[PDB]
Design a protein around this ligand. Sequence first.
Ligand SMILES: C=CC1=C(C)[C@@H](Cc2[nH]c(/C=C3N=C(/C=C4/NC(=O)[C@H](C)[C@H]4CC)C(C)=C/3CCC(=O)O)c(CCC(=O)O)c2C)NC1=O
Ligand SMILES: C=CC1=C(C)[C@@H](Cc2[nH]c(/C=C3N=C(/C=C4\NC(=O)[C@H](C)[C@H]4CC)C(C)=C\3CCC(=O)O)c(CCC(=O)O)c2C)NC1=O
Ligand SMILES: C=CC1=C(C)[C@@H](Cc2[nH]c(/C=C3N=C(/C=C4\NC(=O)[C@H](C)[C@H]4CC)C(C)=C\3CCC(=O)O)c(CCC(=O)O)c2C)NC1=O
Ligand SMILES: C=CC1=C(C)[C@@H](Cc2[nH]c(/C=C3N=C(/C=C4\NC(=O)[C@H](C)[C@H]4CC)C(C)=C\3CCC(=O)O)c(CCC(=O)O)c2C)NC1=O
Ligand SMILES: C=CC1=C(C)[C@@H](Cc2[nH]c(/C=C3N=C(/C=C4\NC(=O)[C@H](C)[C@H]4CC)C(C)=C\3CCC(=O)O)c(CCC(=O)O)c2C)NC1=O
Ligand SMILES: C=CC1=C(C)[C@@H](Cc2[nH]c(/C=C3N=C(/C=C4\NC(=O)[C@H](C)[C@H]4CC)C(C)=C\3CCC(=O)O)c(CCC(=O)O)c2C)NC1=O
Ligand SMILES: C=CC1=C(C)[C@@H](Cc2[nH]c(/C=C3N=C(/C=C4\NC(=O)[C@H](C)[C@H]4CC)C(C)=C\3CCC(=O)O)c(CCC(=O)O)c2C)NC1=O
Ligand SMILES: C=CC1=C(C)[C@@H](Cc2[nH]c(/C=C3N=C(/C=C4\NC(=O)[C@H](C)[C@H]4CC)C(C)=C\3CCC(=O)O)c(CCC(=O)O)c2C)NC1=O
Ligand SMILES: C=CC1=C(C)[C@@H](Cc2[nH]c(/C=C3N=C(/C=C4\NC(=O)[C@H](C)[C@H]4CC)C(C)=C\3CCC(=O)O)c(CCC(=O)O)c2C)NC1=O
Ligand SMILES: C=CC1=C(C)[C@@H](Cc2[nH]c(/C=C3N=C(/C=C4\NC(=O)[C@H](C)[C@H]4CC)C(C)=C\3CCC(=O)O)c(CCC(=O)O)c2C)NC1=O
Ligand SMILES: C=CC1=C(C)[C@@H](Cc2[nH]c(/C=C3N=C(/C=C4\NC(=O)[C@H](C)[C@H]4CC)C(C)=C\3CCC(=O)O)c(CCC(=O)O)c2C)NC1=O
Ligand SMILES: C=CC1=C(C)[C@@H](Cc2[nH]c(/C=C3N=C(/C=C4\NC(=O)[C@H](C)[C@H]4CC)C(C)=C\3CCC(=O)O)c(CCC(=O)O)c2C)NC1=O
Ligand SMILES: CCC1=C(C)/C(=C/C2=NC(=C\c3[nH]c(/C=C4\NC(=O)[C@H](C)[C@H]4CC)c(C)c3CCC(=O)O)/C(CCC(=O)O)=C2C)NC1=O
Ligand SMILES: CCC1=C(C)/C(=C/C2=NC(=C\c3[nH]c(/C=C4\NC(=O)[C@H](C)[C@H]4CC)c(C)c3CCC(=O)O)/C(CCC(=O)O)=C2C)NC1=O
Lengths: 61, 160, 150, 161, 92, 177, 177, 177, 177, 103
Amino acid sequence: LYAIETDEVSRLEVDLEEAKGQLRVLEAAMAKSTPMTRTAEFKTLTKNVAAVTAAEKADPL
Amino acid sequence: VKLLNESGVEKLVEQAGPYTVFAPTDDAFAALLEPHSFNKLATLLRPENNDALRKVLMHHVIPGAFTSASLMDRAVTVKSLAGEPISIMGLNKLVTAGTAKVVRADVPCANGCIIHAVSSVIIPPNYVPVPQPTKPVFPRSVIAEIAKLPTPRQALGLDP
Amino acid sequence: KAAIMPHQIVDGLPVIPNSEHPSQKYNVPKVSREKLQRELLIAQGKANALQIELDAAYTSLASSRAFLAPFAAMAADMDIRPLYGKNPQVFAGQFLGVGAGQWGKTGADTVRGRSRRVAADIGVKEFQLERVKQLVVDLQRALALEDAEA
Amino acid sequence: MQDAITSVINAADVQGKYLDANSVEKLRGYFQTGELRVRAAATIAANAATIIKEAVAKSLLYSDITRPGGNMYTTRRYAACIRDLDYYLRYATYGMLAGDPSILDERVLNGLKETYNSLGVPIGATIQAIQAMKEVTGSLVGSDAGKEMGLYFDYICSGLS
Amino acid sequence: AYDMDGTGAGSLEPRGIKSSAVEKDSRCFKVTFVLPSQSRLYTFRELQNVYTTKMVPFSSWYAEQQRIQKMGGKILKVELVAGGQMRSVGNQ
Amino acid sequence: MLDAFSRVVVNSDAKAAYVGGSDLQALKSFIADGNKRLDAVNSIVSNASCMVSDAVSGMICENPGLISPGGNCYTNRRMAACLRDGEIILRYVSYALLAGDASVLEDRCLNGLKETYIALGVPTNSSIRAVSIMKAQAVAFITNTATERKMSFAAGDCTSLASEVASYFDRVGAAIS
Amino acid sequence: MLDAFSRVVVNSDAKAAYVGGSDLQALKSFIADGNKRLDAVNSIVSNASCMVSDAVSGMICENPGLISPGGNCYTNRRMAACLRDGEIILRYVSYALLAGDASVLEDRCLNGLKETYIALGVPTNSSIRAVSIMKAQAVAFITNTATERKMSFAAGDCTSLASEVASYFDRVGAAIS
Amino acid sequence: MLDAFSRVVVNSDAKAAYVGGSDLQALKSFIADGNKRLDAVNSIVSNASCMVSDAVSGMICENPGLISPGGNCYTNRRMAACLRDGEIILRYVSYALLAGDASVLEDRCLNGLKETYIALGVPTNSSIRAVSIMKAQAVAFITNTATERKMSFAAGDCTSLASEVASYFDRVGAAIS
Amino acid sequence: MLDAFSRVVVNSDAKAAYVGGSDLQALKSFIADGNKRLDAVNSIVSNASCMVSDAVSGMICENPGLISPGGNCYTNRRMAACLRDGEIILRYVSYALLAGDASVLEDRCLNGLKETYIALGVPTNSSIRAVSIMKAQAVAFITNTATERKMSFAAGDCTSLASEVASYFDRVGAAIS
Amino acid sequence: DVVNAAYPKNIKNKAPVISFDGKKGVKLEMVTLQTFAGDDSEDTLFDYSSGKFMPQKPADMGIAWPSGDGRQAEMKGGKGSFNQPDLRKYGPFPDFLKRSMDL
Ligand SMILES: C=CC1=C(C)[C@@H](Cc2[nH]c(/C=C3N=C(/C=C4/NC(=O)[C@H](C)[C@H]4CC)C(C)=C/3CCC(=O)O)c(CCC(=O)O)c2C)NC1=O
Ligand SMILES: C=CC1=C(C)[C@@H](Cc2[nH]c(/C=C3N=C(/C=C4\NC(=O)[C@H](C)[C@H]4CC)C(C)=C\3CCC(=O)O)c(CCC(=O)O)c2C)NC1=O
Ligand SMILES: C=CC1=C(C)[C@@H](Cc2[nH]c(/C=C3N=C(/C=C4\NC(=O)[C@H](C)[C@H]4CC)C(C)=C\3CCC(=O)O)c(CCC(=O)O)c2C)NC1=O
Ligand SMILES: C=CC1=C(C)[C@@H](Cc2[nH]c(/C=C3N=C(/C=C4\NC(=O)[C@H](C)[C@H]4CC)C(C)=C\3CCC(=O)O)c(CCC(=O)O)c2C)NC1=O
Ligand SMILES: C=CC1=C(C)[C@@H](Cc2[nH]c(/C=C3N=C(/C=C4\NC(=O)[C@H](C)[C@H]4CC)C(C)=C\3CCC(=O)O)c(CCC(=O)O)c2C)NC1=O
Ligand SMILES: C=CC1=C(C)[C@@H](Cc2[nH]c(/C=C3N=C(/C=C4\NC(=O)[C@H](C)[C@H]4CC)C(C)=C\3CCC(=O)O)c(CCC(=O)O)c2C)NC1=O
Ligand SMILES: C=CC1=C(C)[C@@H](Cc2[nH]c(/C=C3N=C(/C=C4\NC(=O)[C@H](C)[C@H]4CC)C(C)=C\3CCC(=O)O)c(CCC(=O)O)c2C)NC1=O
Ligand SMILES: C=CC1=C(C)[C@@H](Cc2[nH]c(/C=C3N=C(/C=C4\NC(=O)[C@H](C)[C@H]4CC)C(C)=C\3CCC(=O)O)c(CCC(=O)O)c2C)NC1=O
Ligand SMILES: C=CC1=C(C)[C@@H](Cc2[nH]c(/C=C3N=C(/C=C4\NC(=O)[C@H](C)[C@H]4CC)C(C)=C\3CCC(=O)O)c(CCC(=O)O)c2C)NC1=O
Ligand SMILES: C=CC1=C(C)[C@@H](Cc2[nH]c(/C=C3N=C(/C=C4\NC(=O)[C@H](C)[C@H]4CC)C(C)=C\3CCC(=O)O)c(CCC(=O)O)c2C)NC1=O
Ligand SMILES: C=CC1=C(C)[C@@H](Cc2[nH]c(/C=C3N=C(/C=C4\NC(=O)[C@H](C)[C@H]4CC)C(C)=C\3CCC(=O)O)c(CCC(=O)O)c2C)NC1=O
Ligand SMILES: C=CC1=C(C)[C@@H](Cc2[nH]c(/C=C3N=C(/C=C4\NC(=O)[C@H](C)[C@H]4CC)C(C)=C\3CCC(=O)O)c(CCC(=O)O)c2C)NC1=O
Ligand SMILES: CCC1=C(C)/C(=C/C2=NC(=C\c3[nH]c(/C=C4\NC(=O)[C@H](C)[C@H]4CC)c(C)c3CCC(=O)O)/C(CCC(=O)O)=C2C)NC1=O
Ligand SMILES: CCC1=C(C)/C(=C/C2=NC(=C\c3[nH]c(/C=C4\NC(=O)[C@H](C)[C@H]4CC)c(C)c3CCC(=O)O)/C(CCC(=O)O)=C2C)NC1=O
């Protein structure tokens, strides 16, 4: 009965379905583009940036 | 944040206690032009009625850190720092705070506090709107009021 | 029908040397009619917000007296006899009266207490309201001459 | 932690140049007021307890922060105030002698407004206490010395705001 | 007991850090700061990290915060993680 | 000016009606309680010098800025013209208590009083908490509950005269607000 | 809505009654006509549930191709969104009438609105008709010259408040043209 | 649907535990106040027909654009449907106060009601008013402080049941917002 | 009797001129087609606020860059000053229509205006665009060929006065060019 | 600039307001008819501040502290004689972060 917190593969597949369930409500809300105002809500830093990713890349114009 | 700074409530939510703020986006404040809600809230626009403004803003602060994940099909109430109970209501991933209908899930803050974006402004339950400023009226005569009081001989039915 | 504006009474009164707030009748700059209307409505708005924090000071004075009124009347029928100061047969030293500069600028500033301390808050808050209520008078009065000569 | 002489030497040193006429011009201006600052710091040391007793009784003695529920109710909380107001009157004395407010933000201002918000200390009543404390300090040291000591009080009030 | 017995100026124990902490206080901060030593170049001791973030109690935050600036430290952030605010009884 | 009986005539003149029989039932109970009204204005006029000195010097206890330099009760010409004005207000309140109707207070005293006090530089907020000390003094003298002076009356109940003179005193503070 | 004036704070522990350093001078001076302004916003938002249904159906009966199949208001998702955009515009006009400046109108409502409607295929020449009905509707309420609804007010004048709110409605209509 | 018993079942099913002695005290106290809850529903059902006419007409006298032509309370079918959904909402709240859990309120009453009121073109701002007038009546009937009908109840307290039905009407008003 | 109009005009201060019965028929005999001409200026000034709020807004409806940040019908004091200037030219046309000459319109209202609008940075092509709208309205109101309104007049022809009001509006645009 | 002497102090007086009040005379008035005004300027003619004032805080000098190291934000006074320039640059810094020249 406790094998949904203690298992090593039910822990992935539960957290896959909640993260896909959070993705499906976020992808549908990103079908609304032009007069939508922007709030930088400052999401967290649980996963660090693996790439360098400088803000100025080049002149691609 | 501007209403907090003017009203002096912002000192209260400066504190380190674990709070769960239900700060409404200004579209919620822009949505205060209901024909209905403008009755009970327009009177606060007057500059002397800061008194109720603290009591209406302090209903949005909840002692404790209630994240939306902590509201998995759970209905728990609590009173604000205003002093009156509010029912937080998370079912079908639709977390409610009175008449909130929360927009953004949570924002992690400094002292383990949480910030949820709501769609409207929660008015406290037993909040009566302040009346508009009126005219102190005085009775013009005194004989229209002695004639307005029933005599003892009237109360016993001795007279009409 | 028409109330007399308070700047038209100031023109009738003879001039005193000392005001609390001396007038800027001659010290208003020659600006246009539209900048006089903006500077009047700003000074009327600052006087409205200064009124409703002076009223919050009066409710704090009324709350400070109710805080101490069970003890203010409970010490009113005690026998409080001092050691000196009343009859001249006892050595009182500096408290024959008060000694050497310690009477103060007013006399009420040497009295301690919760209701005397919120009262000094009232007198500094009513000074700022009366200063800006006399500033809307000569802003209005120039308005009379902005229009009367117009 | 720099005085007027330390700040003058730093700016003249940070460009690698000697003390020219402009750098010594301010230094002479500081030495002229050297006699005023010591006597100002003299009387403030004498009437330290009297000044703080005058400020709290004139600003926040009887307000409802003093009553129950207010921010200053319990005796530990009241005693923390006069301990707390002592630093403002003391560190302002240091700025008045050093002629430079660098010591204030170095040792007072940093983490101060962020600390009062943690404790829930009312910044509004705090500044008015310092303003009232600035008002009595101009009584003792005189006008211009009060202008000097007063110049660092509102520096605390500005940053603490 | 607590640090406010009556000690002030002119008292037998030396004039020192006086904290407004109650009997056995249970409030503690979460502070963050850098504190360069400014003494290693004539002592030549080993080096230790100066950027620390730790929980200091309310009983001794003021002494620590008063000392962190003594040696030129800068306090980046402090919070009251454990304890209440405006709480008359219960800080014990 | 009007009194209590001229007030009921100008209501009856508005409909061109005679003062009949049903509205004489209330006028006969006004004159039946007319001896309590004369017994009430006698408890104000007898105490009237100490009423405006308990009030003006109690206004100073809540505002030390009046007796600071530049203040409104500062110099001797200015304290004398405030002790003058405090007993003019007590004079016209006792006229309307005697006349039964507040018409002599509203046009001979309270009309134009606010913008009079702007022009001289009088603080109108200090006048409101000065005439509210006299309001509490008068209702202690009507109902014989002052602590330092008791007067000798017959037995009964004068609470309706207490809240009629209380309404003449918050009619003053509505005019200088 | 509650940013559109200035409250004053009087209690302690506020850090705006003492250290705040400013009364809002441009917003203390807007309660100087503020009883006239609050009645004017009360005329609109007590009729805004009738104003948006009259204006949207005004352009349907003046242009019947919008409820044609293939028209932009045929489906029930589109008919609900056209009623929602009229109310949201009418609220932000009622912000700018209340606040006295059109900064809040051109920031939240009008910024990026012409680029929205030509991306969605919304006809702009018919949409300005629906705003200009509400321009003609709102001046009838504020001057109280509406036909089938009058409202009780205090006696006076309300021109240059109907003329102020006519200056916001074309400002909407030129930003979307 | 669920109730106050089966809410702590499916909460104890999530932890895969038995309903032990630490959770029966949430239920044995609920049944010990079972007579108070049945006396609390009976204040609502006995005034259920006059509360809905009290509340929909109070929506009309605050928002008079609903009875104007082009509104949403205009015709007799539209008025009787607005008297229907005032009491259909009141039917499910009185189930949800009786059951002790808001599952019946969030699966039958609120089962896409926001999607209905958009697609019907019902103004959602006025239906927040019509729900919340019934909230302000139900906390006056349960606490027996209605101003014009007192029911005879045994003395005690109902601040818990008044605050429970105030959280069911806000949960309706949160979801149709 | 025409001097008593101009004595109110040229006296460099404020006045009025109430015209009575026996003075009226001397004016109607003096003014040629006076019963048409007194209907001609009545068809303008009874629709004065409707004609301004088209003509200021129709300038913005064709030139939308004026209410852009940086335009001149931004910053609401400037937007209200354009509407007062549009109201002044509409009035001073109608006095020239009443008096039958463009002389009083030229010296009081129109001389020095070309130097005024280039001293304030007023875009002078849009002011000709604004008065061409008011030129288009006043020929329609006089001829009773207005669109949403029609006026109840005595029947006849007023094309000669409609050409006469065409000759006043272009003199404005010939001056501010 | 006030070039408006051509528009004198009888400026916006608005003579042609005409009210017929029936079939009778035209009743021409002289009403000025002001706008929805507001006259927007900053720094008006008086103070309008009665106490409650300590708002002033110095500018942020980056990560050092405010107003501490302004030795890079100064004019200059001296330079010296035997100073000789540098080869690498490593261009100019935010004030050598926290310690001053008198550390
Ligand atoms: C049976 C014969 C007979 C007449 C000839 C008239 C004579 C007459 N006409 C008018 C009606 C009038 N209406 C006008 C108006 C006019 N507008 C214009 O553009 C034209 C120039 C002019 C028409 C010629 C004039 C000038 C008079 C005459 C002056 C007058 O008495 O008012 C009036 C005034 C009362 C009224 O309006 O009826 C009288 C007594 N009446 C009669 O009963
Ligand atoms: C809390 C909400 C709130 C409101 C709704 C208003 C309500 C309101 N309006 C006015 C008072 C007034 N209101 C109006 C407005 C109007 N009169 C008309 O004939 C026009 C049609 C209409 C403008 C659209 C006028 C002209 C006055 C008189 C005072 C004045 O002109 O400043 C007053 C003062 C009453 C008095 O002292 O006489 C109040 C309380 N104020 C508030 O605080
Ligand atoms: C030192 C500071 C100082 C004060 C704070 C006041 C004290 C004071 N006294 C009264 C109140 C009063 N003052 C009087 C006056 C008198 N009593 C008598 O018996 C005499 C005949 C007469 C003086 C000649 C009376 C009758 C009351 C009413 C209280 C009572 O005794 O019942 C009030 C009114 C309360 C209110 O605001 O509503 C106040 C504030 N006076 C001061 O001096
Ligand atoms: C020339 C001056 C002059 C006066 C001063 C009064 C004097 C006066 N007072 C009362 C008589 C009275 N006075 C009062 C009044 C009061 N009693 C109280 O307990 C209250 C403290 C106070 C209310 C104000 C009462 C209750 C009576 C007796 C009942 C009554 O007369 O109606 C009476 C008796 C009338 C009667 O009994 O028929 C008289 C003559 N009349 C005058 O002609
Ligand atoms: C804060 C300001 C603010 C606004 C002004 C509106 C603006 C706006 N309208 C629409 C979206 C829309 N707006 C309309 C409205 C209309 N089309 C017409 O033909 C009529 C002329 C007009 C009604 C009067 C329609 C029909 C859609 C839906 C378009 C579609 O889905 O095809 C959208 C896209 C997202 C949505 O579906 O809502 C936005 C952002 N929303 C806002 O948040
Ligand atoms: C062919 C279809 C058609 C319609 C649906 C209506 C809709 C409609 N009404 C008005 C015009 C108006 N509409 C209103 C609105 C209202 N009046 C009230 O009493 C209510 C409170 C509220 C409607 C619920 C007002 C006040 C006016 C101004 C004219 C008037 O006073 O009636 C206009 C603008 C007309 C103009 O500006 O000249 C339109 C298109 N008219 C039509 O021609
Ligand atoms: C499951 C729960 C449940 C409800 C809550 C109700 C609510 C409800 N009302 C209507 C239908 C309606 N509902 C309203 C109601 C209102 N319009 C207003 O202006 C007011 C704000 C509000 C009344 C208070 C009106 C006016 C209609 C008529 C629409 C029509 O006839 O097409 C409909 C569509 C039904 C139909 O027309 O076929 C529904 C589902 N019925 C339910 O089964
Ligand atoms: C302008 C129009 C208008 C109305 C029609 C009434 C309607 C109305 N009544 C109440 C408030 C209430 N309404 C009722 C309803 C009723 N009383 C009963 O005993 C019956 C069951 C039922 C009438 C048949 C009750 C019980 C209260 C609580 C207070 C009380 O009456 O004791 C409220 C909520 C409080 C408020 O916002 O005012 C409203 C809007 N009020 C208005 O402002
Ligand atoms: C079949 C239908 C049915 C009912 C209608 C109720 C009837 C009911 N109510 C109560 C009993 C009660 N009801 C209340 C409730 C209240 N009292 C107040 O003063 C408040 C206004 C109100 C709160 C909502 C209280 C306080 C008691 C007594 C204490 C208790 O039972 O817990 C009791 C127990 C005491 C008794 O025997 O009367 C019963 C049977 N039960 C039922 O089975
Ligand atoms: C009796 C005769 C009479 C007139 C003819 C007008 C002429 C006039 N216009 C303005 C003043 C103005 N006039 C305009 C007008 C416009 N700018 C535009 O973009 C539009 C094209 C146009 C309106 C449709 C503006 C915007 C100002 C104000 C300039 C400013 O404040 O920046 C001023 C004030 C100048 C000053 O104070 O120095 C005057 C006298 N007024 C009069 O009293
Ligand atoms: C007081 C009531 C009243 C009105 C509302 C107007 C209505 C009106 N507008 C115009 C005529 C016009 N009206 C406008 C105004 C506008 N057009 C637009 O593009 C926008 C929709 C709107 C600005 C918001 C314009 C631009 C013209 C045409 C002017 C021209 O010829 O260029 C005409 C002239 C037609 C004719 O004479 O036959 C009339 C009667 N007139 C009145 O007497
Ligand atoms: C007291 C103030 C006063 C006025 C407001 C006017 C109004 C007016 N005009 C005419 C009479 C008239 N009015 C007009 C005018 C017009 N007819 C049209 O077809 C055009 C649309 C419109 C031109 C704008 C004409 C053509 C006549 C008839 C000829 C004339 O009398 O001049 C009449 C007489 C009608 C009758 O005999 O019953 C009156 C009262 N005259 C006044 O004395
Ligand atoms: C709950 C614990 C607690 C205490 C004890 C407390 C005391 C306290 N005593 C005060 C004043 C005062 N206290 C006294 C007391 C005395 N005078 C004497 O002669 C006696 C020896 C003694 C009383 C028995 C006096 C005279 C003042 C006013 C001093 C002044 O006005 O300067 C004040 C300032 C005014 C006020 O806000 O009340 C406080 C806060 N606060 C607290 O929270
Ligand atoms: C040298 C620079 C410096 C300052 C300024 C400083 C302040 C400081 N003030 C404190 C508390 C406090 N400060 C106050 C002060 C006040 N209450 C009021 O109402 C007034 C507005 C105000 C007096 C002016 C109170 C009441 C506490 C106790 C708070 C508590 O027990 O929760 C504390 C908590 C620990 C302690 O006091 O022992 C610190 C560290 N520390 C420093 O290093």
